[PDB]
Amino acid sequence: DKISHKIDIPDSAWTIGIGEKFKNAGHPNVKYPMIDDSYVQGAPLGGFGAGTIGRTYNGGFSRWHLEIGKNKYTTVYANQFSVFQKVEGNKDGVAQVLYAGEPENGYLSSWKWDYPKESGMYYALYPNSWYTYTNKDLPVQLAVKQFSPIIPYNYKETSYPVAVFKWTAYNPTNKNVDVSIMFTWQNMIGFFGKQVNVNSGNFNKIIKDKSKDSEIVAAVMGNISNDNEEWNGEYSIGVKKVPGVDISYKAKFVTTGDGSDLWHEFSKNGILDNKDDETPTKQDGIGSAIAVNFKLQPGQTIEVPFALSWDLPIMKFGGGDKWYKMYTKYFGKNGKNSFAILKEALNNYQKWEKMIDDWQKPILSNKSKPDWYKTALFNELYYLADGGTAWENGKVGEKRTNNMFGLLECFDYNYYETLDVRFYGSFPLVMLWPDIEKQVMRQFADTINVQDSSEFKVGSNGAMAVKKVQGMIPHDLGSSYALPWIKINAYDWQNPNIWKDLNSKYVLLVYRDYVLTGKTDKEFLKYTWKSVKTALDKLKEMDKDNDGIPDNEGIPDQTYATWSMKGTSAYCGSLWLAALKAAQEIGKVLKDNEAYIKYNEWYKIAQQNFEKELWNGEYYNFDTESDHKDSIMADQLAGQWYADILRLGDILPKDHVQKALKKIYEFNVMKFENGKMGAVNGMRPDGIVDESDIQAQEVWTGVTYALASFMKYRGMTEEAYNTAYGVYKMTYDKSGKGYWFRTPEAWTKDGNYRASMYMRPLSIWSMEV
Ligand SMILES: OC[C@H]1O[C@@H](O[C@H]2[C@H](O)[C@@H](O)[C@H](O)O[C@@H]2CO)[C@H](O)[C@@H](O)[C@@H]1O
Ligand SMILES: [Ca+2]
C-alpha cells in the first residue's frame, strides 16, 4: 500500500476491505415487511433535493434515491470505473473492472469482473469517500477521492446533482507503465418513471469544451423527447484534461449486450474508438464511456478528475404533484443542463475540497475527541442527502418566495418531517443549514390552525377520528406516495391530534432555532408566535385533574405510543415545563407582557406538581398512573435536555437531574448488554428490562445520542461517550451489526433492527452544541 501515503485520508474515516464479506449483519425484528438492502452500502453522492446515488464499498452504483422519497436497491452493472495497465515493452496488458462482483444476468459478460479480495480498501468520512487499489497484478497503484460539495451555510452547491471523482495514480516500480482509467455510465433515462418502452428515444452525444485553461470531454446521455416529465432529462459523465494525459471516448455502447463492443477496444490498449454515434435506441439499453490514457515513469504521480452529473429537474409524488428541484434555480428547469453542471464541478472541485476541509477541520484537529466519535458524527450526516430529501423550486406549470423542504422520517415510515422525530434529528440543519431549518418550522407554523373535519380509520384499533384538529400540530407534512406539504398527517396508525408531546416539541423547536442561530432572529419569533401560544393553550385544555400539566390518557398519545403513559409523565411533563419556560422567554423578547405572566404562572404551578408527583429520591418516575410507573426511562428528562440547549436554566433541581442521569447510565446503559449497545428505553428498578411493550425493550439510536449530549452538558463526560460508544459500535464496528449508512431507529438485545435509514440518529450533532 504505497498509494495511501500519496493521498490524505483522515484517521477517523470508516474503513472496510473492497469485496469484504461481513458475517454478523442484523435483519428486521418485526413481522410486517421492512427494507433490508444488506450491508453492502456506501456514502451517498448528490446534493440536498437532487436525488442521491449510493455507491457501495464494492464499487457498485447500487442504492438509488433519484426518485425522491423512494429507495431502490439494484446495481446498474454498466456504471463502473475500469483500469487498463501495460508495463512498457510488454506485448499485452491487463484490464479490470473496479467492482468486487459480477452481473446476475448474462449482460456485459466480456468485461473482466470480480475485482479480487484483499486488494484494496474503501474509506468514508461524509461527504468524502475513497477507494484505494493495491493489487499484485496492477503495477501502478490507484486511489480515487469521490464527493459532492456538501457545505454548511451554503445553499447553492449543496443542492447540486453532481459527483467528482479525483483519481491519483502512482508508479512504485522501476519500469514505465501505460495506464488507462475509464468511466462507463448507462443512459438511465427511463430507469424510473416509464411504464413502457423504458429505453425508447434514449441517445448519447459527446461534448468537447476547449477553453484555453481547461479542456473537458463529456458524454451527455439524454432522450429525443422534450417532454417536461419526471423521467426526462440528462445524465453526464466526463473528465478534465491534465498535463501528460490524453482522452478517448465511446458515445454509444449497448448495455443490454455482451459488452465486447466496448471491451475489445479498452482491453487491447486502454484507448477507445472516439466514435460519436448519436442515433437513438428503441429497445436496447445504451451507455457512454470516457477514458484517459497516460504513461507513468518510475516514482511519478498524476492526478486526473472525472465527474458525474444528473439533470433530472422534476420530482413527482404519488398524488400527482410535480415540483422542480432546488438546483434548477442555478442551472435551469428544461432538463438539458447536465453538461453545465459537470463543467462547473470539473473547473471548481479544488475550491469545493478546501471548503469541505475548512468545515471538517475544527472537529478533526481536536485531539481530545476520539476518532470513533468523529466517524459517527460525520458519517451520520449521510441521511441529510439520502433521506428522500425534497427541496422545491416551484410547482410545475407556474414565481414564489420560499423553497419548501422535506426530510423523511425513513423509507419504511414514509412521512416528511415527522415532528416528534425531527425534535431529535434536526440538529444538523439548525447548526449547519439554519435557513432550511427555519423554513421547515414556518411550514409547521402555517399548519397549526388548519382544520380537516373529514375522518380517517385509525389503524391500531379501527376507530374513526378527525384528520386535523385546529390548534394541534401535525405528526408530519405528508408522504412521497401522496402530496408533501399539501396533504399533512399522512400517518394514520394512531391519532396525532390527541398527542401530548407534539405541541410542546414544536414550541421547543421554535425557540431552539432562535437560540442556536445567535438570538438575533426576532422576525422568526414574530412569524411563529401565534402558533406557539395557540399550541400551548390547546395543550393546557388536556389537563384533566387540574395539576397544571397535560394528562396522558393511557392510550396512544405520544412518541412512545404503544409503551403507554397515563397521568403526569416524566417525558411529556418535562417537555411541557420546558416549552412553558421557552414561551416565557419569547414573551419577554417580543414585549408580550401578558403572555409572559400567563406562561410563568402555568410554569411555576406545573413545576411544583411535577416534582411532587414524580421525584422518588433517585430518579423521576415514568408516570403517575401506569402499570409500569416506576420504570426508569432513558428519555425521562427530555424537557430539561432541551432547556440546557436553549439556555433556559434549571426546570428541575440540578441535584435531582444529576441523580436521574447517573441512574439511567447505571441501569439503562451499563445493565443492558454491558453498555455496549446504547441505552435501552425502559428498565425496572430491579435491573431487568421493562417488558410491558416492545418499545421499552428497544434501544433508540437517536434517543441515546441525545442522552449522551445531555450527560455531556451536565459534566458526565465519561458516561456520555460510553453511552454513545455503543451506538457507534453497533453501526460501524466489525463487532456490530453492519448498519453503516443505514442507521436504524431501533435495535433489540439481539442486535436486530427496526426501520433502517432513520432520521433520528442525526441527533448525534446535539453533542456538538
Ligand atoms: O419508532 C417511533 C416512531 O414510530 C412511528 O410509527 C411507526 C411505529 O413505530 C410502528 O410500530 C408502526 O408499525 O408503523 C408506524 C408508522 O406508520 C411514528 O411515525 C413516529 O412518530 C414515532 O416516533
Ligand atoms: Ca394533569
For ligand 1, atom 3, the nearest C-alpha belongs to 559
Helix (H) or strand (E) holding 686: none
What residues form DSSP beta bridges with 185?
288
Question: Of 302, 331, 364, which residue is a domain's last?
Answer: 364
Whether a cis peptide bond, with omega within 30° of 0, leads into 127 is yes
Name which of 35, 71, 37, 30 is nearest 51 in CA terms. 71
Q: Which ligand is nearest to the CA of 609?
A: 2
- The domain of 558 spans 365-769
Q: Experimental method for this entry?
A: X-ray
**What is the resolution in angstroms?**
2.3
**Atom nearest to 496 CA in ligand 1:** 21
Best residue among 413, 476, 635, 756 to mutate for probing ligand 1's pocket (most ligand atoms within 8 Å of CB) is 413
For 653, other C-beta atoms within 10 Å of its C-beta total 11
Ligand 2 centroid – CA 545 distance (Å): 5
**Atom nearest to 694 CA in ligand 1:** 11
What residues form DSSP beta bridges with 167?
144, 304
Are 348 and 496 in a shared domain? no
| For helices 570-590 and 502-515, angle between their N-to-C axes, nearest 10 degrees | 50
> What span, in angstroms and rounded, lies between the C-alpha atoms of 580 and 753?
36
- For 78-126, what is the HEC assignment? CCEEEEEEEECCCCCCEEEECCCCCCCCCCCCCCCCCCCCCCEEEEEEC
Write out the three cell numbers for 144. 480515487
Helix (H) or strand (E) holding 722: helix 717-732
Number of structural domains in the chain: 2
Q: Which ligand is nearest to the CA of 425?
A: 1
Measured in whole angstroms, the distance separating CA 64 from the mean position of its chain's CA atoms is 13
- Cβ-proximal residues to 627 (8 Å cutoff; 6+ apart), any chain: 692
Are 352 and 465 in a shared domain? no
- The residue count of the chain comes to 769
Residue with cell 416492545: 694
Three-class SS state of 682:
strand
Ligand 1 centroid – CA 536 distance (Å): 24
Write out the three cell numbers for 572. 411529556
For ligand 1, atom 20, the nearest C-alpha belongs to 559
Ligand 1 centroid – CA 413 distance (Å): 7
Work out the angle at residue 27's Cα, subtended by the Cα atoms of residues 25 and 29, and round it to the nearest 5 degrees. Answer: 140
Helix (H) or strand (E) holding 622: none
Ligand 1 centroid – CA 695 distance (Å): 10
User: H helices within 561-621, ranges in order?
Assistant: 570-590, 593-614
Annotated binding site: 543, 545, 547, 549, 551
Q: Dihedral sign for Cα 251, 254, 255, 260, please.
A: negative
| For helices 717-732 and 371-379, angle between their N-to-C axes, nearest 10 degrees | 60
| For helices 434-445 and 502-515, angle between their N-to-C axes, nearest 10 degrees | 140
Ligand 1 centroid – CA 86 distance (Å): 56
Ligand 2 centroid – CA 567 distance (Å): 6
Three-class SS state of 617:
coil
For ligand 1, atom 22, the nearest C-alpha belongs to 559
Are 335 and 401 in a shared domain? no
What residues form DSSP beta bridges with 632?
683
Please report, for residues 213, 221, 465, the alpha-carbon distance to residue 340 in angstroms, rounded to integers and kept in the order given. 17, 13, 51
Write out the three cell numbers for 305. 478528475
Q: Where are the beta strands (DSSP E) in 262-334?
A: 286-296, 301-311, 314-316, 322-325
**Atom nearest to 754 CA in ligand 1:** 1
Ligand 2 centroid – CA 612 distance (Å): 13
Helix (H) or strand (E) holding 47: none
> What span, in angstroms and rounded, lies between the C-alpha atoms of 93 and 399?
57
**Atom nearest to 409 CA in ligand 1:** 19
Helix (H) or strand (E) holding 467: strand 464-468
Task: Give yes or no for a contact between 607 and 614, defined as CB atoms under 8 angstroms apart.
Answer: no
Q: Which ligand is nearest to the CA of 421?
A: 1
Three-class SS state of 758:
coil
What residues form DSSP beta bridges with 334?
none
Task: Give yes or no for a contact between 631 and 622, defined as CB atoms under 8 angstroms apart.
Answer: yes
Are 481 and 611 in a shared domain? yes
Task: Give yes or no for a contact between 116 and 19, defined as CB atoms under 8 angstroms apart.
Answer: yes
Write out the three cell numbers for 611. 416534582
Annotated binding site for Ca(2+): 543, 545, 547, 549, 551
For ligand 1, atom 16, the nearest C-alpha belongs to 413
**Atom nearest to 413 CA in ligand 1:** 16
Task: Give yes or no for a contact between 52 and 385, defined as CB atoms under 8 angstroms apart.
Answer: yes
Ligand 1 centroid – CA 418 distance (Å): 10
Are 525 and 494 in a shared domain? yes
Are 317 and 448 in a shared domain? no
Ligand 1 centroid – CA 749 distance (Å): 19
Work out the angle at residue 512's Cα, subtended by the Cα atoms of residues 664 and 530, and round it to the nearest 5 degrees. Answer: 125
> What span, in angstroms and rounded, lies between the C-alpha atoms of 205 and 217?
11
Q: Dihedral sign for Cα 657, 380, 422, 33, please.
A: negative
Three-class SS state of 232:
coil
**Atom nearest to 493 CA in ligand 1:** 17
Ligand 1 centroid – CA 682 distance (Å): 17
Instruction: Please provide the DSSP assignment of 325-381 as one string.
Output: ETTHHHH-SSS--HHHHHHHHHHHHHHHHHHHHHHHHHHHT-TTS-HHHHHHHHHTT
Instruction: Please provide the DSSP assignment of 383-399 as one string.
Output: HHHHS--EEEEEES---
Question: Of 364, 388, 410, which residue is a domain's last?
Answer: 364
Are 11 and 154 in a shared domain? yes
- Burial class from Cβ neighbours inside 10 Å (0-12, 13-18, 19+) for residue 153 reads exposed
Measured in whole angstroms, the distance separating CA 102 from the mean position of its chain's CA atoms is 28
**Atom nearest to 760 CA in ligand 1:** 23
**Atom nearest to 459 CA in ligand 1:** 17
Instruction: Give residues (CB < 6 A) around ligand 1.
Output: 409, 413, 415, 418, 420-421, 491, 493, 559, 745
Q: Which ligand is nearest to the CA of 492?
A: 1
Name which of 383, 393, 462 is nearest 424 in CA terms. 383
Are 299 and 419 in a shared domain? no
Best residue among 414, 493, 572 to mutate for probing ligand 1's pocket (most ligand atoms within 8 Å of CB) is 493
For 460, other C-beta atoms within 10 Å of its C-beta total 13
Termini Cα distance of the chain? 39
Q: Where are the beta strands (DSSP E) in 134-233?
A: 141-147, 162-170, 177-186, 202-210, 215-223
**Atom nearest to 32 CA in ligand 1:** 13
Ligand 2 centroid – CA 698 distance (Å): 28
Are 750 and 692 in a shared domain? yes
Q: Which ligand is nearest to the CA of 695?
A: 1
Question: Of 309, 341, 364, which residue is a domain's last?
Answer: 364
For ligand 1, atom 12, the nearest C-alpha belongs to 493
Write out the three cell numbers for 224. 429525443
> What span, in angstroms and rounded, lies between the C-alpha atoms of 593 and 587?
6
Are 73 and 187 in a shared domain? yes
Q: Which ligand is nearest to the CA of 545?
A: 2
Are 413 and 449 in a shared domain? yes
Are 346 and 460 in a shared domain? no
Task: Give yes or no for a contact between 150 and 385, defined as CB atoms under 8 angstroms apart.
Answer: yes
